């Protein structure tokens, strides 16, 4: 039987060892999660590289000439500017009735993909769905039609100038202009959907087809900044076209009345419920428009939900709370003994008010001016220099030992 002092020392040693072991477990779990995410990003990049290589293969003039040689002359008489949805539907219907899928076709490991496509065109048979999609893409590109090959990690997008909009085309099932059907026939998990144009530009068209983009896909996608950086070199110079596409995507997203689950409203820019608001979050204005009702709970836009911070917090943020303003939000505060007084007397736990002022209640910070050779100070005889812009004008900071003595 150990002496109580030795037992306590042993318990301390066991606790410290257990804590260090838990820390090592946390570090290992973080490292493994990071490695898994890096491997997923690498796989996504590899798929993107394969798609780029295939698209560059599909830009050969020989393939376009072969496709045009099979297109009837009635289709070539229609100008690309005059291509409509009815013409696309007729072309798809003609394509299905002429091109048939034959899985019995041999797959050679040595022949190039271009040679395989040429042979499929010559026999008018496709080994699988992807080859049929490539064949239809080549046929569309034969008529000088701006078409994007769309892959989900496949179908086509044709840009109509009369509508100035992209109509989706699925050649296997005869689907034209039905993004929901394209999402239906796609892979079960839809997280990234990319359309690569003939010019090589890549556009994330996942918003048009996936209605789960805002609800689960957003929480299940890669980092938005990382994906934006990936797509930035491949952004088309047609800025207006991208802006119109994004506006159409926003319009489609606004068409959704409301999600079915209250949990979907948690931390959602388009949903932003009441109960989900954090400590610094408040709805401004309090008379904001209601987007809907879910189980009796009103829905407000996140732009109406502003993050409010304390007056000294704004001062740290180079902002000054306007004098005489009533604090928009009252929250609890974490401080010295003034804080613990709430614990001392529970009735004071909600009595202590921390005034959070909105950005609409704060103006830009204005640095002070030295007066009579003396540095302006805080309310407590100090100078706060969290930001160099808050330094008093005409004063210089010198970090020397015993400088105060001198």
């Amino acid at each position: 039987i150990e002496t109580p002092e030795q037992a306590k020392t042993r318990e301390r040693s066991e606790k410290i060892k257990l804590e260090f072991e838990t820390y090592l477990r946390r570090a290992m779990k973080r490292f493994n999660k990071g490695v898994h995410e890096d491997t997923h990003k690498v796989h996504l990049l590899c798929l993107l590289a394969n798609g780029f290589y295939r698209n560059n293969i599909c830009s050969q003039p020989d393939l376009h000439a072969i496709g045009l040689s099979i297109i009837p002359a009635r289709f070539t008489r229609v100008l690309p500017r005059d291509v409509d949805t009815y013409y696309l539907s007729n072309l798809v219907k003609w394509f299905i009735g002429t091109f048939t899928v034959n899985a019995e076709l041999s797959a050679s490991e040595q022949d190039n993909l271009q040679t395989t496509l040429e042979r499929r065109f010559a026999i008018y048979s496709a080994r699988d769905d992807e080859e049929l999609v490539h064949i239809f893409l080549l046929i569309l590109r034969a008529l000088q039609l701006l078409t994007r090959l769309v892959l989900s990690l496949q179908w086509l997008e044709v840009f109509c100038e009369q509508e100035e909009k992209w109509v989706c085309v699925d050649c296997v099932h005869g689907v034209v202009g039905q993004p929901l059907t394209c999402y239906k026939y796609a892979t079960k998990p839809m997280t990234y959907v990319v359309g690569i144009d003939s010019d090589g530009w890549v556009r994330d068209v996942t918003q048009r087809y996936d209605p789960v983009w805002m609800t689960v896909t957003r929480k299940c996608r890669v980092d938005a900044e990382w994906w934006a950086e990936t797509l930035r070199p491949y952004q088309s110079p047609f800025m207006d076209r991208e802006k119109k596409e994004d506006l159409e995507f926003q319009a489609k997203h606004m068409d959704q009345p409301l999600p079915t689950a209250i949990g979907l409203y948690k931390n959602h820019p388009l949903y932003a419920l009441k109960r989900h608001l954090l400590k610094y979050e408040a709805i401004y204005p309090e008379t904001a428009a209601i987007l809907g009702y879910c189980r009796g709970e009103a829905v407000y836009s996140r732009d109406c939900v502003h993050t409010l911070h304390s007056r000294d917090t704004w001062l740290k943020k180079a902002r000054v709370v306007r004098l005489g303003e009533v604090p928009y939000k009252m929250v609890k505060g974490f401080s010295n003994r003034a804080r613990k007084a709430r614990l001392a007397e529970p009735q004071l736990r909600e009595e202590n008010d921390l005034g959070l002022f909105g950005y609409w209640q704060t103006e830009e910070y204005q640095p002070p001016v030295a007066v009579d050779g003396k540095v302006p100070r805080n309310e407590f005889g100090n100078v706060y220099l969290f930001l160099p812009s808050m330094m008093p004008i005409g004063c210089v900071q010198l970090n020397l030992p015993n400088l105060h003595r001198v």
Partner: protein, 61 residues
């Protein structure tokens, strides 16, 4: 200039071999991943950012 951390791997012979593997033969692409499976903490750490140089290097014949 903005010297990228992947600059040294520009002339790395194994890195050049893996770049050639990515460029032409996808059958050897999993073998490239095998190098990832051996030791590649820094390469995957820095592959998140500044991928334009990485893509151009991969496309280099």
């Amino acid at each position: 200039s903005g010297g990228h951390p992947l600059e040294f791997l520009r002339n790395q012979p194994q890195f050049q071999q893996m770049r050639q593997i990515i460029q032409q033969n996808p059958s050897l692409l999993p073998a490239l991943l095998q190098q990832i499976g051996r030791e590649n903490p820094q390469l995957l750490q820095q592959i998140s950012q500044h991928q334009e140089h990485f893509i151009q290097m991969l496309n280099e014949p």
